[PDB]
Design an enzyme around this catalytic site. Structure first.
Site, PDB file in Angstrom:
ATOM      1  N   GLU A  87      -4.960   4.190 -10.695  1.00 52.79           N
ATOM      2  CA  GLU A  87      -5.795   3.009 -10.466  1.00 52.79           C
ATOM      3  C   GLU A  87      -6.956   2.953 -11.446  1.00 52.79           C
ATOM      4  OE1 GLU A  87      -5.996   1.652  -6.073  1.00 52.79           O
ATOM      5  OE2 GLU A  87      -5.836   3.823  -5.903  1.00 52.79           O
ATOM      6  N   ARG A 102       0.119   4.660   2.914  1.00 52.14           N
ATOM      7  CA  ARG A 102       0.164   4.391   4.348  1.00 52.14           C
ATOM      8  C   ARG A 102       0.632   5.542   5.211  1.00 52.14           C
ATOM      9  NH1 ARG A 102       3.908  -0.592   4.759  1.00 52.14           N
ATOM     10  NH2 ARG A 102       4.404  -0.092   2.543  1.00 52.14           N
ATOM     11  N   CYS A 123       0.826  -1.232   0.000  1.00 52.82           N
ATOM     12  CA  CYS A 123       0.000   0.000   0.000  1.00 52.82           C
ATOM     13  C   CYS A 123       0.847   1.263   0.000  1.00 52.82           C
ATOM     14  CB  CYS A 123      -0.953   0.045   1.225  1.00 52.82           C
ATOM     15  SG  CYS A 123      -1.968   1.589   1.286  1.00 52.82           S
ATOM     16  N   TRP A 159      -9.132   6.635  -0.499  1.00 57.06           N
ATOM     17  CA  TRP A 159      -9.426   7.414  -1.694  1.00 57.06           C
ATOM     18  C   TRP A 159      -8.419   7.046  -2.784  1.00 57.06           C
ATOM     19  CZ3 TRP A 159      -8.025  10.055   2.897  1.00 57.06           C
ATOM     20  CH2 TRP A 159      -6.675  10.450   2.952  1.00 57.06           C
TER      21      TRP A 159
HETATM   22  C1  HEM Z   1      -6.208   6.661   1.884  1.00 61.01           C
HETATM   23  C2  HEM Z   1      -5.612   6.562   0.691  1.00 61.01           C
HETATM   24  C3  HEM Z   1      -5.098   5.221   0.105  1.00 61.01           C
HETATM   25  C4  HEM Z   1      -4.389   5.148  -1.023  1.00 61.01           C
HETATM   26  C5  HEM Z   1      -3.970   6.344  -1.904  1.00 61.01           C
HETATM   27  C6  HEM Z   1      -4.087   3.759  -1.278  1.00 61.01           C
HETATM   28  C7  HEM Z   1      -3.370   3.302  -2.353  1.00 61.01           C
HETATM   29  C8  HEM Z   1      -3.202   1.985  -2.704  1.00 61.01           C
HETATM   30  C9  HEM Z   1      -2.795   1.472  -4.004  1.00 61.01           C
HETATM   31  C10 HEM Z   1      -2.481   2.306  -5.262  1.00 61.01           C
HETATM   32  C11 HEM Z   1      -2.742   0.143  -3.928  1.00 61.01           C
HETATM   33  C12 HEM Z   1      -2.372  -0.795  -5.095  1.00 61.01           C
HETATM   34  C13 HEM Z   1      -3.617  -1.606  -5.446  1.00 61.01           C
HETATM   35  C14 HEM Z   1      -3.598  -2.090  -6.872  1.00 61.01           C
HETATM   36  O1  HEM Z   1      -2.933  -1.459  -7.745  1.00 61.01           O
HETATM   37  O2  HEM Z   1      -4.285  -3.116  -7.129  1.00 61.01           O
HETATM   38  C15 HEM Z   1      -3.123  -0.238  -2.576  1.00 61.01           C
HETATM   39  C16 HEM Z   1      -3.198  -1.511  -2.064  1.00 61.01           C
HETATM   40  C17 HEM Z   1      -3.564  -1.839  -0.769  1.00 61.01           C
HETATM   41  N1  HEM Z   1      -4.010  -0.981   0.240  1.00 61.01           N
HETATM   42 FE1  HEM Z   1      -3.959   1.069   0.189  1.00 61.01          FE
HETATM   43  N2  HEM Z   1      -4.625   2.989  -0.257  1.00 61.01           N
HETATM   44  C18 HEM Z   1      -5.268   3.862   0.611  1.00 61.01           C
HETATM   45  C19 HEM Z   1      -5.948   3.472   1.749  1.00 61.01           C
HETATM   46  C20 HEM Z   1      -5.896   2.234   2.352  1.00 61.01           C
HETATM   47  C21 HEM Z   1      -6.570   1.841   3.579  1.00 61.01           C
HETATM   48  C22 HEM Z   1      -7.499   2.805   4.372  1.00 61.01           C
HETATM   49  C23 HEM Z   1      -6.242   0.549   3.815  1.00 61.01           C
HETATM   50  C24 HEM Z   1      -6.648  -0.380   4.972  1.00 61.01           C
HETATM   51  C25 HEM Z   1      -7.290   0.058   6.056  1.00 61.01           C
HETATM   52  C26 HEM Z   1      -5.349   0.098   2.752  1.00 61.01           C
HETATM   53  C27 HEM Z   1      -4.766  -1.147   2.608  1.00 61.01           C
HETATM   54  C28 HEM Z   1      -4.288  -1.693   1.427  1.00 61.01           C
HETATM   55  C29 HEM Z   1      -4.012  -3.094   1.206  1.00 61.01           C
HETATM   56  C30 HEM Z   1      -4.120  -4.293   2.177  1.00 61.01           C
HETATM   57  C31 HEM Z   1      -3.511  -3.171  -0.236  1.00 61.01           C
HETATM   58  C32 HEM Z   1      -3.099  -4.434  -0.999  1.00 61.01           C
HETATM   59  C33 HEM Z   1      -4.390  -4.815  -1.719  1.00 61.01           C
HETATM   60  C34 HEM Z   1      -4.223  -6.115  -2.448  1.00 61.01           C
HETATM   61  O3  HEM Z   1      -3.163  -6.769  -2.234  1.00 61.01           O
HETATM   62  O4  HEM Z   1      -5.151  -6.473  -3.223  1.00 61.01           O
HETATM   63  N3  HEM Z   1      -5.180   1.152   1.902  1.00 61.01           N
HETATM   64  N4  HEM Z   1      -3.385   0.914  -1.863  1.00 61.01           N
HETATM   65  C1  LIG Z   2      -8.480   1.150   0.409  1.00 60.71           C
HETATM   66  C2  LIG Z   2      -7.893   1.300  -0.983  1.00 60.71           C
HETATM   67  C3  LIG Z   2      -7.620   2.554  -1.515  1.00 60.71           C
HETATM   68  C4  LIG Z   2      -7.090   2.652  -2.810  1.00 60.71           C
HETATM   69  N1  LIG Z   2      -6.820   3.861  -3.366  1.00 60.71           N
HETATM   70  N2  LIG Z   2      -6.851   1.535  -3.528  1.00 60.71           N
HETATM   71  C5  LIG Z   2      -7.094   0.304  -3.027  1.00 60.71           C
HETATM   72  C6  LIG Z   2      -6.820  -0.918  -3.883  1.00 60.71           C
HETATM   73  C7  LIG Z   2      -8.013  -1.046  -4.833  1.00 60.71           C
HETATM   74  C8  LIG Z   2      -7.720  -1.875  -6.065  1.00 60.71           C
HETATM   75  C9  LIG Z   2      -8.047  -3.226  -6.055  1.00 60.71           C
HETATM   76  C10 LIG Z   2      -7.791  -4.005  -7.177  1.00 60.71           C
HETATM   77  C11 LIG Z   2      -8.144  -5.475  -7.154  1.00 60.71           C
HETATM   78  C12 LIG Z   2      -7.178  -6.211  -6.231  1.00 60.71           C
HETATM   79  C13 LIG Z   2      -7.274  -7.719  -6.441  1.00 60.71           C
HETATM   80  N3  LIG Z   2      -6.161  -8.405  -5.765  1.00 60.71           N
HETATM   81  C14 LIG Z   2      -6.706  -9.428  -4.862  1.00 60.71           C
HETATM   82  C15 LIG Z   2      -5.306  -9.052  -6.769  1.00 60.71           C
HETATM   83  C16 LIG Z   2      -7.216  -3.431  -8.314  1.00 60.71           C
HETATM   84  C17 LIG Z   2      -6.878  -2.074  -8.348  1.00 60.71           C
HETATM   85  C18 LIG Z   2      -6.251  -1.468  -9.600  1.00 60.71           C
HETATM   86  F1  LIG Z   2      -7.137  -0.708 -10.219  1.00 60.71           F
HETATM   87  F2  LIG Z   2      -5.864  -2.414 -10.439  1.00 60.71           F
HETATM   88  F3  LIG Z   2      -5.181  -0.737  -9.322  1.00 60.71           F
HETATM   89  C19 LIG Z   2      -7.146  -1.300  -7.210  1.00 60.71           C
HETATM   90  C20 LIG Z   2      -7.630   0.172  -1.742  1.00 60.71           C
HETATM   91 CL   LIG Z   3     -10.234   0.169  -8.787  1.00 61.83          CL
END
Ligand code: HEM
Ligand SMILES: Cc1cc(N)nc(CCc2cc(CCCN(C)C)cc(C(F)(F)F)c2)c1
Ligand SMILES: [Cl-]
Ligand code: HEM
Ligand SMILES: Cc1cc(N)nc(CCc2cc(CCCN(C)C)cc(C(F)(F)F)c2)c1
Ligand SMILES: C[C@H](O)[C@H](O)[C@H]1CNc2nc(N)[nH]c(=O)c2N1
Ligand SMILES: C[C@H](O)[C@H](O)[C@H]1CNc2nc(N)[nH]c(=O)c2N1
Ligand SMILES: OC[C@@H](O)[C@@H](O)[C@H](O)[C@H](O)CO
Ligand SMILES: [Cl-]
Ligand SMILES: [Zn+2]
Lengths: 410, 411
Positions: free
Chosen positions: A286, A112, A109, A281
């Site tokens: 994304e 964070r 993430c 947000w």
């Molecule tokens: C507040 C602004 C936040 C931003 C800008 C953000 C941004 C991102 C981004 C760009 C990813 C990559 C996901 C992808 O490309 O598929 C990600 C993954 C992730 N985020 Fe954050 N996030 C935010 C909030 C949060 C919050 C509030 C949580 C948990 C309480 C969180 C937990 C995670 C987790 C566990 C992943 C890995 C998801 C996965 O492996 O599928 N994020 N985040």
């Molecule tokens: C809480 C939160 C905030 C934020 N800005 N982005 C996220 C991740 C959301 C997201 C999910 C997923 C699916 C995840 C599936 N895994 C299990 C492989 C894809 C994408 C994206 F669009 F590809 F970047 C973005 C989560």
């Molecule tokens: Cl998305």
């Protein structure tokens, strides 16, 4: 054993000691790195107390009362509760700490730097899917906040013996449907074709449009999942326009404002919360890079390129790259204009580097997955590209878990 | 033990068995992944197993495993080792070795070309002047009037580690960098230290923004010597943009031949510390890294200014917009001058086909995702969505310390 990370753009070196407290596995060995692999029955009571202890220890350490009578009393209390009930219940304070730290520990993430400002909604008193629906509508309304988004998580009851699992079946609280064609084509979002099938097969009547908000499919206490429609007035959406290309509007694109992951598992002190939707947000890319331009998604590159009248006969014109940038300009432009919170990948990665430095200094490290942290466009002009990162697993954590439909005894 | 990788764009799944032949370490453990870390003399005891393994592999590939020729060669090498504490590769083995080091290079996206490598055997070289002559011929051959050809020149192997052959340049052709008293840098900031050494060694620096560096060559553990590559051998390309006429006025050019010269080639336990190799450029190497890294020529803002981009907020993506235009210009300029170059779309696509072929015929293809994915437009290239396994096979190219850090100066 006391590892160094270097930034090759700034020559800054950080020393990591936090990794020594890692306990879960990476998937890697001395012979093979699996850094790019996407995905590398309840616990017994003897498995549970060391987990509880480790958590309580770091909790009481974090409030400066390590080795205090209050600390020892709690360990005692939980110790007996486990021996007696084969599980235990977290105090509100511990639940909140655990959730904030599961986000803090999410190595994939980039957002964070915000981890300590997480609104935690305790839904452990919930017993039914209608109850879950109510808690989730409240979450969505709170988090959305008329466009001024606020991070939140809602935590439903913990797993007991895996017969009573609470699950949100959808992968995000808000997502667009994906449909079949006789054309062989795919209308809407291809990522959601299977889930959309289950919705219909469970009784959903779809508008079969290109951007239909999916219904919630909620499972309480191990029961069969139930359909609910999020009140449309709660789902904030943004029409996508370009600040310079008038024709962009005619593509008819829109996206939702609230990214809300609902299919992961929150582990705190050995306890498993299988239904714990959380939201923050968007980072612009994304939507604009992945959602819109992945070939297995809405895949709108070729159509945008044509309307820009770019040279699409050879790849070396970089028309794909050019359209990619314009699409991502439009997304940011649209959200910003509607005063819906969004962050661009430059700002977000800049913030994450500041967060890393904060974490190394005040905590001794920051687990980070470079493959996921580096944005899907313009990678090397973001500071994270030149930042060495160490990846390791700390608990409390968010974990992946099987899709419910493959698991559910119907 | 079988290992699966998945492509998440196409759902193609491949199975790796080649990883079983993996020798060296990764830097990773079950508790920590070091996949984003950039950098994580031999005795008679360790050498014959390494030799035997190489020779077994060599004779397997030529379908002569277990043959009398195979057995005689092992015996021959064993004796030569016990007698002389080292051994000499046959020409065929050297060529095989060098091609397979490229084939095993997990950070290289251009490996579809690995079987078409021109190998120049310079193991009879004894002096720096000799080295200079070999390298001029390499440059001329590889450049081929813009129709680039992959090549490697291999100088004598390490012996007691006190008589090393080294090329002190990190690349055969590269521009100087000069730190100014005001803290600014003229030319390429990446080469300021080496430029300073060259200057100390007697190089008369022109002190311009694109000065081709002299060759600094060390033979047989002696102090290195300065040589100027003949200008007529150094092919360069003026950078112009197809639609922006002001772009030429930025005064940019680049050289056509990418030639890495600071790595160590390991073959059957033998160490070749001087082994310059060259291919042709992927556009983003120049257009993204060389031009647009903050620690390099760093031209984003000047390009963006001239484009009149909205630069007061990063969310205008003025940086991204200018990055694309620059990379268009680089490709445009090389193609119009008929100098071999490949765009990142073509190259990554070819790599996927290569990788798949390698799984089918070789049982795998070790690959470093962090390095294979291009530095711009990552997920619109197919390698972004491809799971990869990273492990180390020999023969291989290894990092080695910069010679000025280790060299014992004679005087
Ligand atoms: C507040 C602004 C936040 C931003 C800008 C953000 C941004 C991102 C981004 C760009 C990813 C990559 C996901 C992808 O490309 O598929 C990600 C993954 C992730 N985020 Fe954050 N996030 C935010 C909030 C949060 C919050 C509030 C949580 C948990 C309480 C969180 C937990 C995670 C987790 C566990 C992943 C890995 C998801 C996965 O492996 O599928 N994020 N985040
Ligand atoms: C809480 C939160 C905030 C934020 N800005 N982005 C996220 C991740 C959301 C997201 C999910 C997923 C699916 C995840 C599936 N895994 C299990 C492989 C894809 C994408 C994206 F669009 F590809 F970047 C973005 C989560
Ligand atoms: Cl998305
Ligand atoms: C022929 C066309 C070739 C292309 C297009 C190509 C492309 C690339 C690129 C883009 C990189 C990444 C470097 C960086 O961004 O820092 C790389 C690395 C590398 N290439 Fe290739 N390459 C080619 C030929 C070769 C040849 C001929 C060899 C050896 C015989 C080779 C071996 C390597 C090695 C060892 C690395 C890693 C070097 C390091 O870590 O510093 N390549 N290549
Ligand atoms: C043979 C060859 C062909 C080709 N197209 N590209 C290369 C790599 C050249 C290159 C080197 C280097 C130096 C890397 C330092 N390592 C020691 C860590 C950097 C880059 C670049 F520009 F950053 F991409 C490109 C080599
Ligand atoms: C820290 C990180 O590993 C470092 O910046 C890497 C990232 N990926 C790269 N990829 C390529 N092709 N070339 C590089 O120099 C780097 N640098
Ligand atoms: C196979 C590879 O690991 C996969 O494409 C990863 C790469 N990096 C990613 N990075 C982010 N932020 N999100 C993703 O879904 C992925 N996918
Ligand atoms: O100015 C010296 C540098 O070019 C040199 O230290 C290189 O960075 C090194 O050879 C790694 O490529
Ligand atoms: Cl280069
Ligand atoms: Zn690893």
């Amino acid at each position: 054993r006391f590892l160094k990370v270097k930034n090759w753009e700034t020559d800054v070196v950080l020393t990591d000691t936090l990794h020594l407290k890692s306990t879960l596995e990476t998937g890697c060995t001395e012979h093979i790195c699996m850094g790019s692999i996407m995905l590398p029955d309840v616990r017994t009571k003897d498995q549970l107390f060391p987990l509880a202890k480790e958590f309580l220890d770091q909790y009481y350490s974090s409030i400066k009362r390590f080795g205090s009578k209050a600390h020892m009393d709690r360990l005692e209390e939980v110790n007996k509760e486990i021996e007696s009930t084969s599980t235990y219940q977290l105090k509100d304070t511990e639940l909140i700490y655990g959730a904030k730290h599961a986000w803090r520990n999410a190595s994939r993430c980039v957002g964070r730097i915000q981890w300590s400002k997480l609104q935690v909604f305790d839904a452990r008193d919930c017993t039914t899917a209608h109850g879950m629906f109510n808690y989730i509508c409240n979450h969505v309304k709170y988090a959305t906040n008329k466009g001024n988004l606020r991070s939140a998580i809602t935590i439903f009851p913990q797993r007991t013996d895996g017969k009573h699992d609470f699950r949100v079946w959808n992968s995000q609280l808000i997502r667009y449907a994906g449909y079949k064609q006789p054309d062989g084509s795919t209308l809407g979002d291809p990522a959601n074709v299977q889930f959309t099938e289950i919705c219909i097969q469970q009784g959903w009547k779809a508008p079969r449009g290109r951007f239909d908000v999916l219904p919630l499919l909620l499972q309480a206490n191990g029961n069969d999942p139930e359909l609910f429609q999020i009140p449309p007035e709660l789902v904030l959406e943004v029409p996508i326009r370009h600040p310079k290309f008038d024709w962009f509007k005619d593509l008819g694109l829109k996206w939702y404002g609230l990214p809300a992951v609902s299919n992961m598992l929150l582990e705190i002190g050995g306890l498993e919360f299988s239904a714990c939707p959380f939201s923050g947000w968007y980072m612009g890319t994304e939507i604009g890079v992945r959602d819109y331009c992945d070939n297995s998604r809405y895949n709108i590159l070729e159509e945008v390129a044509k309307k820009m009248d770019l040279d699409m006969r050879k790849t070396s014109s970089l028309w794909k790259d050019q359209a990619l940038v314009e699409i991502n300009i439009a997304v940011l432009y649209s959200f910003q204009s509607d005063k819906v919170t969004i962050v661009d990948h430059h700002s977000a990665t800049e913030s994450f580097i500041k967060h890393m430095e904060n974490e190394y200094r005040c905590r001794g490290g920051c687990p980070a997955d470079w493959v996921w942290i580096v944005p899907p466009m313009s990678g090397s002009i973001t500071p994270v590209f030149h930042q060495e990162m160490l990846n390791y697993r700390l608990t409390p954590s968010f974990e992946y878990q099987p899709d419910p439909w493959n698991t559910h005894v119907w």
